[PDB]
Amino acid sequence: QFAKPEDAVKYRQSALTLMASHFGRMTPVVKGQAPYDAAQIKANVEVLKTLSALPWAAFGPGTEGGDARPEIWSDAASFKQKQQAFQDNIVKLSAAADAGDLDKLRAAFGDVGASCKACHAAYRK
């Protein structure tokens, strides 16, 4: 869907910005600093689930740029592993949010965050 590589960069950066907002806005809730409304978090995680599937299609062949390391493309299987692991952890977060269980939400949220950090370390400049 991208006329030039730059367009893919702009898309993924926006997707990741949104993803990050929908994840990080739950921090005060998982820490207990903000109240836990199970329905609010369920709805928010549903949005996060949608967003978290979006960035990966915008790292297609030839879309090198932004802060993406070139190893995303030359190690495609390893990058794909990190993104599928992250998405699998999003599935676990969805299950916790759907269950309305603050303890499971906290644990699942920590797993997601670690998946973000792991891909960041390997694949972001």
Q: Are 54 and 87 in contact (CB under 8 A)?
A: no
Q: Are 104 and 68 in contact (CB under 8 A)?
A: no
Sole binder of its own copies in the list 5, 18, 100, 119 (CB under 8 A)? 18
Mark the segment that binds its own copies (CB under 8 A) among 21-29, 67-75, 104-112, 116-124.
Answer: 21-29
Helix (H, G, I), strand (E, B) or coil at 32: coil
Sole binder of its own copies in the list 6, 31, 50, 110 (CB under 8 A)? 50
* CB of residue 74 to its own copies, shortest distance in Å: 26
* CB of residue 52 to its own copies, shortest distance in Å: 12
Helix (H, G, I), strand (E, B) or coil at 64: coil
Q: Does 13 bind its own copies (CB under 8 A)?
A: yes
Q: Does 4 bind its own copies (CB under 8 A)?
A: no
Please state, in angstroms and rounded to a whole number, the distance separating the CA atoms of residues 36 and 100: 9
| DSSP one-letter code for 1 | -
Q: How many CA atoms lie within 13 A of 16 on its CB side?
A: 20
| 120 annotated as ligand-binding | yes
Binding site for its own copies (CB under 8 A): 1, 7, 10-11, 13-15, 17-18, 21, 24-25, 47, 50-51, 54
